């Protein structure tokens with residue numbers, strides 16, 4: 169199948185229009201690039217902000233709200249008939265430090281006095297409610313899907329002990345969903361988003377957390393599976409079990425940040441796109457073929473599949489693409505091979521079905537067909 173321009177190619181969202189929406193994460197400057205705009209209009213019917221809707225982007229200082237960048241994404245979505253996902257109301261990264269400072273300016277996590285810790289908990293929860301209220305009151309009529317909390321379960325199977333949890337305990341999760349439903353109403357859909365949702369003990373810990381929260385009447389509508397995955401892991405059988413188990417609790421499932429890395433973990437990356445062997449793209453295409461056949465099998469349980477980017481010229485995985493060099497200066501991509509030094513974050517990954525020149529890859533043909 170030819171490496172044709174993705175602007176002359178069959179629309180990816182139309183191939184999946186009865187199964188689930190097809191989305192992309194974007195930055196506002198991509199809306200000023202003719203190729204990226206052309207790609208969003210041609211192939212996607214859902215959009216999400218890669219970064220400008222995170223807590224530190226929206227309220228960098230208490231009371232100073234920047235909706236300008238977020239507004240540009242929302243206006244583009246509306247003009248183009250796209251669904252919008254909000255990422256994300258609560259997270260322990262890209263979150264402003266002012267949330268966690270007491271009235272005298274000291275970090276609340278340092279407080280030992282029980283009465284003062286309880287006062288700090290209430291102050292943090294009030295600030296959390298106001299952040300959520302201001303955002304949902306502005307976008308409740310435009311944005312259907314919301315990542316209310318992101319990454320609240322740890323990889324060890326315990327709740328993540330971030331400042332949110334250290335200061336307020338489980339109530340910050342409850343307050344966040346409660347607040348989004350209160351100001352957004354019943355028509356917005358609320359999600360708990362996380363990575364490695366297919367991996368134990370995290371998977372069981374998330375399951376138990378959401379089961380309990382719903383038993384308590386906390387309003388959660390679905391689970392976002394970030395799906396930052398590799399060519400061989402996690403297995404499709406494990407992805408299927410995961411999606412099925414959350415659907416059995418009555419939860420919608422969205423694949424929210426899909427990218428299929430060319431590497432393992434920790435990744436040993438090629439230094440440029442040019443150096444990635446052709447065989448890697450065929451291995452990736454076979455993975456995409458099996459993944460999307462599985463998503464179609466489970467389409468009644470998945471409302472959206474969103475890629476964490478548009479095309480291979482821009483992906484956050486490049487920040488993880490470390491390049492290892494041997495004593496002679498040769499690149500090393502075998503995890504067990506000798507190496508002398510590493511250049512962190514300087515290599516290139518190639519995770520999508522669209523190449524860096526906006527031409528389709530073998531993975532695109534693998535998912536646009538009906539085999």
Ligand SMILES: O[C@@H]1[C@@H](O)[C@H](O[C@@H]2CO[C@@H](O[C@@H]3CO[C@@H](O)[C@H](O)[C@H]3O)[C@H](O)[C@H]2O)OC[C@H]1O
Pocket residue numbers: 218219318363394425484
């Ligand atoms: O310097 C800052 C950068 O580090 C920052 O990079 C962004 C980090 O978040 C990325 O998105 C996350 C990927 O991991 C998932 O688990 C999360 O849910 C996603 O939000 C994003 O792709 C990177 O651009 O960018 C902002 C700089 O200030």
Ligand SMILES: O[C@@H]1[C@@H](O)[C@H](O[C@@H]2CO[C@@H](O)[C@H](O)[C@H]2O)OC[C@H]1O
Pocket residue numbers: 319363364396433
């Ligand atoms: O900050 C988070 C990263 O730590 C996370 O990376 C994962 C770490 O565990 C590995 O098994 C996974 O391969 C890798 O993706 O990604 C999400 C990000 O928010």
Ligand SMILES: [Cl-]
Pocket residue numbers: 482483484485
């Ligand atoms: Cl990025």
Ligand SMILES: [Cl-]
Pocket residue numbers: 523524525
């Ligand atoms: Cl190419």
Ligand SMILES: [Zn+2]
Pocket residue numbers: 179181182209210211212213
């Ligand atoms: Zn379309």
Ligand SMILES: [Zn+2]
Pocket residue numbers: 441442
């Ligand atoms: Zn090139």
Ligand SMILES: [Zn+2]
Pocket residue numbers: 186187188467468469470471472
């Ligand atoms: Zn569906």
Ligand SMILES: [Zn+2]
Pocket residue numbers: 195218482483484
């Ligand atoms: Zn980016």
Ligand SMILES: [Zn+2]
Pocket residue numbers: 171523525527
């Ligand atoms: Zn090319």
Ligand SMILES: [Zn+2]
Pocket residue numbers: 457461533534535536537538539
């Ligand atoms: Zn196929």
